[PDB]
């Protein structure tokens, strides 16, 4: 279970977040995906943040 879990924070200013997993050993670079933000009702770039 080396594949740790992270969260994809909206870059729309909302504190909305998707949660997911990654292998930080093999993918050290940050994950950036364009996902839907249901508060703004737009597709916004989410960025990887810590699950905390």
């Amino acid at each position: 279970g080396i594949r740790e879990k992270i969260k994809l924070v909206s870059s729309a200013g909302t504190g909305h977040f998707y949660t997911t997993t990654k292998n930080k050993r093999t993918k050290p670079e940050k994950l950036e995906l364009k996902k839907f933000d249901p508060v703004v009702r737009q597709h916004v770039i989410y960025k990887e943040a810590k699950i905390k």
Binding site: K5, T19, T20, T21
Partner: protein
Amino acid sequence: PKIKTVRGAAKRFKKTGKGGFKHKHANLRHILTKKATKRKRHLRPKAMVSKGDLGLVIACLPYA
């Protein structure tokens, strides 16, 4: 003496109009990133208590 209410069931169940009991679904408290969103979406709304396990609730909740 009066019957005493099982206070956990009183914190977990509510009587509806026709006498049924509503309750929250389980499995929605943690471990939530691996579960599909469809599953969670079908777990947010309250559900009715089934006919089989409705007798134990009525026995625990005599005062509605």
